[PDB]
Every structure is written in C-alpha cells, then in structure tokens.
Design a protein around this motif. Structure first.
Motif, short mmCIF file in Angstrom:
data_model
loop_
_atom_site.label_atom_id
_atom_site.label_comp_id
_atom_site.label_asym_id
_atom_site.label_seq_id
_atom_site.Cartn_x
_atom_site.Cartn_y
_atom_site.Cartn_z
N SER A 197 -23.45 29.96 -2.95
CA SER A 197 -24.62 30.13 -3.78
C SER A 197 -25.57 28.94 -3.56
CB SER A 197 -24.17 30.39 -5.22
OG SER A 197 -23.55 31.66 -5.33
N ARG A 198 -25.06 27.71 -3.37
CA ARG A 198 -25.93 26.56 -3.11
C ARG A 198 -26.52 26.71 -1.71
NH1 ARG A 198 -26.57 22.21 -5.61
NH2 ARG A 198 -28.73 23.03 -5.36
N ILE A 199 -25.74 27.03 -0.67
CA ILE A 199 -26.25 27.19 0.69
C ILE A 199 -27.44 28.15 0.69
CG2 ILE A 199 -25.64 27.64 3.10
CD1 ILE A 199 -24.04 25.37 1.90
N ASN A 200 -27.33 29.22 -0.09
CA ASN A 200 -28.37 30.23 -0.20
C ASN A 200 -29.70 29.61 -0.66
OD1 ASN A 200 -27.31 33.65 -0.46
ND2 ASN A 200 -25.94 32.09 0.24
N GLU A 201 -29.71 28.81 -1.74
CA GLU A 201 -30.93 28.18 -2.28
C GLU A 201 -31.39 26.92 -1.52
OE1 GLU A 201 -29.83 25.53 -5.93
OE2 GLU A 201 -28.32 27.05 -6.13
N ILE A 202 -30.45 26.13 -1.00
CA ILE A 202 -30.70 24.89 -0.27
C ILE A 202 -31.37 25.16 1.06
CG2 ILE A 202 -29.51 22.94 0.92
CD1 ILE A 202 -29.55 22.55 -2.12
N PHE A 203 -30.88 26.15 1.80
CA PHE A 203 -31.40 26.48 3.12
C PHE A 203 -32.30 27.73 3.12
CE2 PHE A 203 -29.02 23.32 5.60
CZ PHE A 203 -27.92 23.00 4.80
N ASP A 204 -32.45 28.42 1.99
CA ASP A 204 -33.25 29.63 1.78
C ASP A 204 -32.78 30.77 2.70
OD1 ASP A 204 -35.46 27.12 2.28
OD2 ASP A 204 -35.83 27.97 0.30
N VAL A 205 -31.47 30.91 2.91
CA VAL A 205 -30.83 31.92 3.78
C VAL A 205 -29.74 32.66 2.98
CG1 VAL A 205 -31.46 30.70 5.96
CG2 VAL A 205 -29.41 30.06 4.76
N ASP A 206 -29.04 33.62 3.57
CA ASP A 206 -27.96 34.38 2.93
C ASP A 206 -26.67 34.18 3.73
OD1 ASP A 206 -26.11 36.21 1.76
OD2 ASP A 206 -27.64 37.67 1.29
N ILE A 207 -25.83 33.24 3.30
CA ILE A 207 -24.55 32.90 3.92
C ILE A 207 -23.44 33.55 3.10
CG2 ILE A 207 -22.96 30.90 4.31
CD1 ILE A 207 -25.25 31.05 6.41
N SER A 208 -22.35 33.93 3.78
CA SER A 208 -21.18 34.55 3.19
C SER A 208 -20.06 33.51 3.05
CB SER A 208 -20.73 35.71 4.09
OG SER A 208 -21.83 36.42 4.64
N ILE A 209 -19.21 33.64 2.04
CA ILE A 209 -18.09 32.73 1.77
C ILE A 209 -17.13 32.57 2.94
CG2 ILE A 209 -15.87 32.88 0.38
CD1 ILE A 209 -18.96 33.75 -1.44
N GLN A 210 -16.93 33.62 3.73
CA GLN A 210 -16.01 33.60 4.85
C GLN A 210 -16.40 32.52 5.86
OE1 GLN A 210 -18.01 36.97 4.77
NE2 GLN A 210 -17.42 36.44 2.71
N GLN A 211 -17.69 32.32 6.12
CA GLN A 211 -18.16 31.31 7.05
C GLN A 211 -17.75 29.92 6.58
OE1 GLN A 211 -22.49 32.43 7.84
NE2 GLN A 211 -21.43 34.22 7.04
N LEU A 212 -17.88 29.66 5.27
CA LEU A 212 -17.53 28.37 4.68
C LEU A 212 -16.05 28.07 4.93
CD1 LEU A 212 -19.49 28.72 1.27
CD2 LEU A 212 -20.36 27.93 3.47
N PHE A 213 -15.16 29.04 4.72
CA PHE A 213 -13.73 28.84 4.93
C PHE A 213 -13.37 28.77 6.42
CE2 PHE A 213 -9.24 30.43 5.11
CZ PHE A 213 -8.65 29.57 4.17
N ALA A 214 -14.15 29.44 7.27
CA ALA A 214 -13.95 29.47 8.71
C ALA A 214 -14.35 28.15 9.37
CB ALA A 214 -14.77 30.62 9.30
N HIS A 215 -15.25 27.40 8.74
CA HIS A 215 -15.75 26.12 9.19
C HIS A 215 -15.53 25.17 8.00
CE1 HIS A 215 -17.79 28.13 12.73
NE2 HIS A 215 -17.87 29.17 11.89
N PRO A 216 -14.28 24.75 7.73
CA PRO A 216 -13.92 23.90 6.60
C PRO A 216 -14.39 22.44 6.65
CG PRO A 216 -11.96 24.18 7.93
CD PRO A 216 -13.07 25.08 8.48
#
Lengths: 104, 31
Positions: free
Chosen positions: A55-74
């Motif tokens: 939810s922060r990545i979404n507002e910080i970078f103004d994009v739509d990131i999914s939780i899976q990416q965050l866990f895939a790149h820890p």
C-alpha cells in the motif's frame, strides 16, 4: 534484550530510489537500520507488514505493485527491479517503443 | 506496442529505456 541477528558489515542504502523504500521499512518493523542484503523476514517483517508495505509502494511511487513482488525480492537491492518496470507502466507504451529502440 | 513489451525485456534494458523516458518526459507525470 537481544533481537535480530548479529551484524559485522552493515550496508548503507543506495541513493534516492533505494533509501526511499528503506526509510519506510524500519518504521514498519520498528527496526534500527535496513541493509541492502538484509532480508525482511530476518529483520522482523511478517506477511501483514508486507500487505501495508505494498500500500505504501503504491502511494510513494504512484504505481500498482503486488505483495508477491515484495516477498520475491526480500531486500532493498532486489526490490528496485520491480520499481523500474512499474514506473515504465505509467509512461505511454506507444512512445516508449520509439525511445526503447533508440537506446544504447 | 503495449505494456507487456516493457515487462518482456530484461532489467538492464528496462532501466536503460526508463532513464531516457523519464529524461525526455514523453508521457511522464508530474502529479
């Protein structure tokens, strides 16, 4: 009073792209610092923290990131790879191809 | 030419074109 794992060589965050996410991480896990190789799971982050992080990545970078990416790149250094592709998505794909074919 | 094209290329090229794109503001957002 003993938490996290023992450090020997902390690695400072990279410039404005990397430090941008890194700054928010310790605030979420209430940690000391974030190293570019430190894994969110070793630091104290758990699945619920990844949900809020997205939810922060979404507002910080103004994009739509999914939780899976965050866990895939820890870690910070791995996570930037997702920002690169997500950032391009806000730019127009038609004009993008014209620049893309002209790149080095 | 569609968004999947950019996600089909590797990170090395991804960041290369992104830099040129951001610098050229072809469709960048200042919001």
């Amino acid at each position: 009073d003993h938490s996290s794992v023992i450090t020997q060589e902390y690695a400072a965050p990279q410039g404005e792209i990397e430090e941008q996410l890194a700054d928010i991480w310790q605030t979420i896990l209430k940690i000391d610092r974030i190293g570019r190789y430190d894994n969110f799971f070793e630091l104290g982050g758990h699945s619920l923290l990844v949900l809020q992080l997205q939810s922060r990545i979404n507002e910080i970078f103004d994009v739509d990131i999914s939780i899976q990416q965050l866990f895939a790149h820890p870690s910070i250094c791995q996570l930037e790879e997702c920002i690169i592709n997500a950032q391009l998505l806000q730019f127009d794909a038609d004009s993008l191809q014209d620049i893309y074919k002209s790149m080095e | 030419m569609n968004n999947n094209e950019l996600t089909s290329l590797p990170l090395a090229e991804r960041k290369r074109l992104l830099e040129l794109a951001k610098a050229a503001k072809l469709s960048r957002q200042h919001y």
